[PDB]
């Protein structure tokens, strides 16, 4: 793995919560990683998730909560007919994106995810091959 | 395919990228602090190796406007270990060093500066003094 990015027992993690000044939202988390050559962590395994929790450890960084890769996201008539024919207005449909969902990681022992508002401050985690 | 980050000016036929650092006079900085600029953002001082690259720096004054200006590249002069010789000249053959000795000589005082006109000139001057700048990236890299 890279300098110094926790090693996947595969992927390679890279914590960053420098500090509650410098959170980003989920978006830019992962313009964040990507423009490293990678993207936001996704944990598919439990090993992959030892790993974060080591990082975690090695870096004294608990409690912090981490944006994690989890991202959420038409229209179906209830009768079951498909949509074979639409009238929308002029921008419609709209409201189902005033907001989205993304899912942080709570950095303890139970490791476990949350979603919350997408454009939350958050510490994030990044993962490079 | 590697491609050349959120413009800079692209070397067609090789892997590097340019950009131009000229925020004023005010903005000017030394080749040392010029190099960790460039390489924070994940490049590092801009080199000429070759006709098409200066080419693509040139082209890259002229869109800007950045005539006449002198900009600070990644020559630097680093004092080759062979480099010493007896007082009429001649190589030194037997050596004595102390232990790790020679070693003043490696002070890195003298660096390369790019002359923004058409002639696309270099002049060696002293690393301290305060310059534009240009660095680069390799494609495929993102700043
Ligand atoms: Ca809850
Ligand atoms: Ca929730
Ligand atoms: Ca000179």
């Not at 980003?24 to 439990?46: H, M, P, Q, V, Y």
């Not at 992959?48 to 038409?74: D, N, P, V």
């Not at 994106?97 to 990681?105: D, I, K």
């Not at 994030?124 to 091959?129: D, G, P």
């Amino acid at each position: 793995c890279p300098e110094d990015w926790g090693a996947s027992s595969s992927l390679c993690f890279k914590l960053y919560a420098k500090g509650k000044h410098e959170k980003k939202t989920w978006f830019e988390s992962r313009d964040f990683c990507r423009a490293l050559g990678g993207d936001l962590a996704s944990i598919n395994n439990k090993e992959e998730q030892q790993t974060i929790w080591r990082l975690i450890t090695a870096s004294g960084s608990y409690h912090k909560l981490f944006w994690l890769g989890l991202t959420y996201g038409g229209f179906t008539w209830s009768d079951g007919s498909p949509v074979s024919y639409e009238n929308w207005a002029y921008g419609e449909p709209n409201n189902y994106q005033n907001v989205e969902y993304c899912g942080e990681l709570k950095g303890d022992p139970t490791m476990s995810w949350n979603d919350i508002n997408c454009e939350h401050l958050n510490n994030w985690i990044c993962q490079i091959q």
